């Protein structure tokens, strides 16, 4: 399962 | 709670990836202001890079001011300017729809918005409705952009070098409005922040973007559903029924090169043409100033 938010947050960092 | 010399905190009015953002009051001037507080013991500290970055992006129309930077009892404090709803937040308030203007009148700030972010040497990887904010009282017709967590130089300062092409990179941003080429692995370059822009204004256009809403069993499943859906929807069919200069400005964003700097100025002269071939008046009526 994957919360409906997960494309809508925003992911990673600077890196 | 005093912080600075001259800041007073009120309550949360924000959370992104890192810290929370308060109203506070400049005491000294009488004047509101937003503060970002985050924890010295945080295992990840951000907000004094992005306190850097934003002192880099300071004279630029749509950048919030920092007002000041430092460190108070637990917390690392950045004092900005107060900005007003999110172009997302005003999207909800106009009914998930926003008239052709409006959209427009959107796009010609925003692609200078990003374009002066180029111009001091960075992308911003986070391009979405949720990262603009319109300006409050006399910049309540300014739409600033904001959240600079994901953002990083694509060029040397000094020399202009480009950063080198790479593969193989995770996800940086957000899946609904992530370029094809950073959901293929690709090292995103000012090309993907101007597609992201374009899918953000469809998005405007449609209510919603045909790859919302994938059903799958993890998050990398997830972006590889919206990855296929993206990959497998033409830009005529993605912008059919809305003017084509949607479609032009997208398969142009599509068409650069890694390396390419964009022609911004042909590509905002693109709307504005429509703008003007619509009989709009640049007058910063926006959908949500007929609220009443
Ligand atoms: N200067 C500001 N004025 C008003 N609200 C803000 C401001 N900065 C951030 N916010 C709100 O807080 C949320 C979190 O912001 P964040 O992504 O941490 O951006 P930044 O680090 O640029 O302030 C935003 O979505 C927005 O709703
Ligand atoms: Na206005």
Redesign the interface.
Known sequence: ??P?S?????????? | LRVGNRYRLGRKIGSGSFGDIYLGTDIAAGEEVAIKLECVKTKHPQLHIESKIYKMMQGGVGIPTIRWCGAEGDYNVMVMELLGPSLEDLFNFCSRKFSLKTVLLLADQMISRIEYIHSKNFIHRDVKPDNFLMGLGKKGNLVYIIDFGLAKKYRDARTHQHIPYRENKNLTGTARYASINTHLGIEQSRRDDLESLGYVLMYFNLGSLPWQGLKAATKRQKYERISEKKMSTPIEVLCKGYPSEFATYLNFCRSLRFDDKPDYSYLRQLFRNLFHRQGFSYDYVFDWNMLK
């Open positions: 399962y994957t409906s997960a494309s809508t947050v925003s992911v990673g960092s600077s890196e």
